[PDB]
């Protein structure tokens, strides 16, 4: 076929040529156990689905329909944040405690400023592998970004050690090789 031929010829012409160092920061990404614990963290903070939302809405609406106005109390919803402009919006306050960044986006240029932007804003970013795995934890097909701001007190101590873990595993390991021109070796 043609499309199989092109998708195999793709990633050959990339690595054969010199990639700029603002790329290939991607795939210098998080290792196995740390990404695993990051997913264990963010599955604790799944956002509400449309079905669960509408279900709670029907519950409270049937409550008010009886009326049976039970109380007026709810702390806040805490969830991951996943809209890209919303993720950037949570930076430049700053509010992002952790950011996950997908390596694979076909318009890469949507994403390329985010490591430098969280670098200058001091936000603990981490480059995650695969936007589908982001979409799974956020009930989308893909997400390509994952910001997290608000955390319960049960999880806040896990958050800080995860931040220190990432800054040890990502910011220390890959920082100098981030500056280097990747690829260029023929296929």
């Amino acid at each position: 076929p043609e499309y199989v031929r092109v998708q195999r010829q793709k990633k050959i012409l990339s690595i054969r040529l010199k990639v700029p160092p603002t790329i290939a920061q991607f795939q210098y990404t998080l290792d196995r156990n740390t990404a695993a614990e990051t997913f264990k963290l963010f599955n604790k903070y799944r956002p509400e689905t449309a079905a669960e939302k509408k279900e709670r809405l029907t519950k409270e609406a049937a409550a008010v329909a009886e009326g049976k106005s039970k109380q007026d109390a709810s702390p806040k919803p805490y969830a991951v944040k996943y809209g890209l402009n919303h993720v950037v919006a949570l930076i430049e306050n700053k509010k992002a405690k952790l950011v996950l960044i997908a390596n694979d986006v076909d318009p890469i240029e949507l994403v390329v400023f985010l490591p430098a932007l969280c670098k200058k804003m001091g936000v603990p970013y981490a480059i995650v592998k695969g936007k589908a795995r982001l979409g799974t934890l956020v009930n989308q097909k893909t997400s390509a970004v994952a910001a997290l701001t608000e955390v319960r007190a049960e999880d806040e101590a896990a958050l800080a050690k995860l931040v220190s873990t990432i800054d040890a595993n990502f910011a220390d390991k890959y920082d100098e090789v981030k500056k280097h021109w990747g690829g260029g070796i023929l296929g």
Partner: protein, 65 residues
């Protein structure tokens, strides 16, 4: 040729955000648009267009037999 990237601007860290945008009211209080959707469902149930889910399970328990 090629040479590694200079990080002159990243290495200074901003201790503050860019914009002095005032915080909105709705970030602190329970969400209004949620409640408007709630009252929409309340008006639909008052018209009976939506059946309560306890009544729905009551319907299904009889209809199964």
């Amino acid at each position: 040729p090629y040479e590694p990237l200079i990080d002159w601007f990243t290495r200074h860290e901003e201790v503050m955000p860019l914009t002095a945008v005032p915080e909105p009211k709705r970030r602190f209080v329970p969400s209004k648009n949620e409640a408007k959707r709630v009252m929409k469902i309340v008006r639909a149930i008052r018209e009976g267009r939506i059946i309560p889910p306890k009544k729905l399970k009551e319907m299904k328990x009889x209809x199964x037999x």
